[PDB]
């Protein structure tokens, strides 16, 4: 059985523009949520989001090429470049066909869809940019990265809304394990903090409207929660077959030992109740890794700060972990970054990997008063030092959609 | 503020080249590194800057800096 | 090794609203391309496309639910329902967790993105529909089908532009072969014939502009070709593990024996030349199936009717098939349907499957004068009866993107 | 052409129910099968048909056919 390890990390998040700076901010409980100021939010019920601060890609992407890329493509490229550099991999003509990418997004390029459609409405089809389509579709992060590094291996882009990150990483590992590749760059990127994004999720009544206190808005499992908070960024991992990684002396952060999927088969307008879909994804991940739930030390929850979804996820954890549910650590880093949608599962896989390296678990901030029946250890307020932790579980749950779970193992 | 200067400025920022490189005899494809979609985007930028409409058959003949200058020259007064 | 067979087919295309009617029209060389009339095309350089004619989903999708779905979602659901009914599968509580979906799209819901953005521009964020996001994102075909049939298995949605169809089918088979599912509904859906679609691909100068003769516009490998023609529709397959299919007495159209992928690692503005990426995808598919190219009787080409791409694909076939290149049959059904983008690989997999069942190959119509060096058998004008054909190859090539190939085997 | 008739018509097509079922006492959720996003979409359709703006706090009280009738009633002249 071909084993799959993680050899490179790259990240942009609302709390940092690198992996280590993001990780340090999260362990310190720092919120990345702030008031939007790049468009007029006067008519919007939600006026804040988790934004990438002081983003500077000029050394990686020329201004000419930036104009052909929606913001989410720029984030994904920069995070991917970070990951490739962190991996220290040398791409040659000999190995180029064995290296690919699995990089997705939930919404893609809303910003440039707006811009080109505005151009169309004001001036007709001759004002649409020739780069409109390649500047906006979700597979273009992989497209640009494969060209920049000369990658010729299998390349896919999974767009499964809020579980895109885990699905892309999980299927990058499947491709490697199957033998179609030896290395894969996998993750996701998102930039939905646009007039159509904020208005669209706000039209669905899904966003928190706590404009007076944006850093307290994202509060998973807290009684005062009122919807999720949008976040922008990107996470990328370099996955590698284990023997390939050891032969070249790669740094090895963790092993990816389990990947499970499921569907809810119910609309989200219907009650989530027990989280049976989330439990099935976790159960499949455990079976795939060949471990019991009691061996998981930390769960990076979905935890979006939505009333019904947070409670159903707590029931799913209770179902899987049983007697060990009181002991396992669970936390939602979305309390600090907001919901990165298709990139959420990607940056959260990174958090689950670094938790194994540093034996420390990031907190769920803003958890001032847990709901009745939200009696698990959610690591409120402050990060938790741990010891002997060998497995972590990273979850992305659709609660009215698809589900994905990844299990990482130390060394 | 000078149409020649204005055209070179647009070409320079569109194709990502310094003003020193935007010579009158430079061709967009062979000299300034443009691809065929870059050329489309460049003509559109010229249309937007000078509030003019360049037909498809004429746009295809705008292949050098001088051609772009000459076109915007003889389509004002 | 878990073998994967095809047990159900569903399709909407420009030449038919069912599998059999589409197949009969294609074998007869019928063009589905016509002038657009659902929006004013006066300012558009391209005024025609392959449209789904007389589409009626009222017996499957209520008018209430249609309003929450872009056209491509409606197509995908109807094709998926056709496939599920054709498979005769009975979903129970016992097997629901073993049945999933892999359904994608290249562009998704451009129509309703336009409508909601127009509402935003004219009335502000309070005019955006609450269903905006779920009515437009690409994974919603799978979302609705999994809910309609109670499917709880693994569900993904691959959005890889023009190769989405083959990637979704191929990875549905991987999921089954890996053991994560016993049945998967897989395919793609597309409806890009909208102001943003036609204008956007027209802005990129990629579309044919032969408005005076739309049915002669799509002419792969013909000297007078001038770009591809947009098409709408959806194709769905029900994939099943072989022993599962035989135990329940399913009808078995074909076996999926090979799946290969690759990336080009070059922008499409750069010369395709030899089609090395397309050749690598075919070579990987052959290795995956364990067969030689000389055993392939028919290749359903990509063949988009683009000048450089058609020639590079012809070189890729020459590379893979070598001495047998003169004997193998190649054809592009896009000459009749246009380019269904993310659904292209899905409907073309169906054509490759039915070619094995009926021992007949659809033609490349409009191939009046082949290019110098386009000397393969492209089955011009008229369908070709064959005998003894046991394997077909279905290709989707990005020529500046990703590549995918599927190999189907008779019985 | 009668606001009561007009409101029932909108409710009927929004929720996909025959006019016979849109009674004055029907609630959208319990009787006419609406979900919470259907209710949002229905209020928006009422806003569009009667060229009025219904604030969020008032929209939440429009839960039955009669409430929608009474609201559009006392917000015209």
Q: Could you please say which CATH topology of chain B applies here?
A: Non-ribosomal Peptide Synthetase Peptidyl Carrier Protein, Chain A
- Overall number of domains of chain B: 1
Q: What is the CA-CA span between the terminal residues of chain A? A: 17 Å
Question: Tally the helices of chain B: what do you get?
Answer: 4
Structural Rg of chain B: 11 Å
The strand count of chain B comes to 0
Strand-residue proportion of chain A: 15-25%
Modified residues (O-(pantetheine 4'-phosphoryl)serine) (chains B, D): 36
Pathway (chains B, D): Lipid metabolism; fatty acid biosynthesis
Domain Carrier (chains B, D): 1-76
Main location (chains B, D): cytoplasm
Quick take:
Chain A is α/β, with parallel strands linked by helices and 411 residues long. Chain A has 12 helices and 14 strands. In chain A, helix 3 crosses helix 5, helix 6 crosses helix 12 and helix 9 packs parallel to helix 10.
What does this structure look like?
Chains B, D: It comes from Escherichia coli (strain K12). The complex is a heterotetramer, with 2 copies of chain A (411 residues) and 2 copies of chain B (77 residues). By secondary structure, chain A is of the alpha/beta class. Chain A contains 12 helices and 14 strands. Chain A has helices spanning 19-27, 63-66, 71-87, 110-123, 140-149, 164-178, 195-203, 242-247, 276-289, 307-321, 334-337, 344-358, and strands spanning 4-12, 33-35, 48-50, 99-104, 155-156, 183-190, 233-241, 254-263, 296-300, 329-331, 360-361, 384-385, 391-397, 402-410. In chain A, strands 5-4-6-7-1-8-14-13-9-10 form a 10-stranded mixed sheet, with helices on both faces. In chain A, strands 2-3 form a two-stranded antiparallel ribbon. In chain A, strands 11-12 form a two-stranded antiparallel ribbon. By secondary structure, chain B is mainly alpha-helical. Chain B has a single domain (3-74), classed as ACP-like (Non-ribosomal Peptide Synthetase Peptidyl Carrier Protein, Chain A, Orthogonal Bundle). In chain B, α1 (3-15) packs antiparallel against α2 (36-50) and α1 (3-15) crosses α4 (65-73). The longest helix of chain B has 15 residues, at 36-50. Chain B is globular and about 30 Å long. Classes of the chains: A alpha/beta (411), B mainly alpha (77). Chains A and C meet through β4, α4, α5, β5 and α6 of A and β4, α4, α5, β5 and α6 of C.
């Amino acid at each position: 059985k071909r084993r799959v390890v993680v050899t490179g990390l790259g990240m942009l998040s609302p709390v940092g523009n690198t992996v280590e700076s993001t990780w340090k901010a999260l362990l310190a409980g720092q919120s990345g949520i702030s008031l939007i100021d790049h468009f007029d939010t006067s008519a919007y019920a939600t006026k804040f989001a988790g934004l990438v601060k002081d983003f500077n890609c000029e050394d990686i992407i020329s201004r000419k090429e930036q104009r052909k890329m929606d913001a989410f493509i720029q984030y994904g490229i920069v995070a991917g470049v970070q990951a490739m550099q962190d991996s220290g991999l040398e791409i040659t003509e000999e190995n180029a066909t064995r290296i690919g990418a699995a990089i997705g997004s939930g919404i893609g390029g809303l910003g440039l869809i707006e811009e080109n459609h505005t151009s169309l409405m004001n001036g007709g089809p001759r004002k649409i940019s020739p780069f409109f389509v390649p500047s906006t579709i979700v597979n273009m992060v992989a497209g640009h990265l494969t060209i920049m590094y000369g990658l010729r291996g299998p390349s896919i882009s999974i767009a499964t809304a809020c579980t895109s990150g885990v699905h892309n990483i999980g299927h990058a590992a499947r491709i490697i394990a199957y033998g179609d590749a030896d290395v894969m760059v996998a993750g996701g990127a998102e930039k939905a903090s646009t007039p159509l994004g904020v208005g669209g999720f706000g039209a669905a009544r899904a966003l928190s409207t706590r404009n007076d206190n944006p850093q307290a808005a994202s509060r998973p499992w807290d009684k005062e929660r009122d919807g999720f908070v949008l976040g922008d960024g990107a996470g990328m991992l370099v996955l590698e077959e284990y023997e390939h990684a050891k032969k070249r002396g790669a740094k090895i952060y963790a092993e990816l030992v389990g990947f499970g999927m499921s569907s809810d088969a119910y609309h989200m307008t219907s009650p989530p109740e027990n989280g049976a879909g989330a439990a099935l994804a976790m159960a499949n991940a455990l079976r795939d890794a060949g471990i019991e739930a009691s061996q998981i030390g930390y769960v990076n929850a979905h935890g979006t700060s939505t009333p019904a979804g947070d409670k159903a996820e707590a029931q799913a954890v209770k179902t899987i972990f049983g007697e060990a549910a009181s002991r396992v650590l669970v936390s939602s880093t979305k309390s600090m970054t907001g919901h990165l949608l298709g990139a959420a599962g990607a940056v959260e896989s990174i958090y689950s990997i670094l938790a194994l390296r540093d034996q420390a678990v990031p907190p769920t901030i803003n958890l001032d008063n847990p709901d009745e029946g939200c009696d698990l250890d959610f690591v409120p307020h402050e990060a938790r030092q741990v010891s002997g932790m060998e497995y972590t579980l990273c979850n992305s749950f659709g609660f009215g959609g698809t589900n994905g779970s990844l299990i990482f193992k130390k060394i | 503020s000078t149409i020649e200067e204005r055209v070179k400025k647009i070409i320079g920022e569109q194709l990502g080249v310094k003003q020193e490189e935007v010579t009158n005899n430079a061709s967009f494809v062979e000299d300034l590194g443009a691809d065929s979609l870059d050329t489309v985007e460049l003509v559109m930028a010229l249309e937007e800057e000078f509030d003019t409409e360049i037909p498809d058959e004429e746009a295809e003949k705008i292949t050098t800096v001088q051609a772009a200058i000459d076109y915007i020259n003889g389509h004002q007064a």
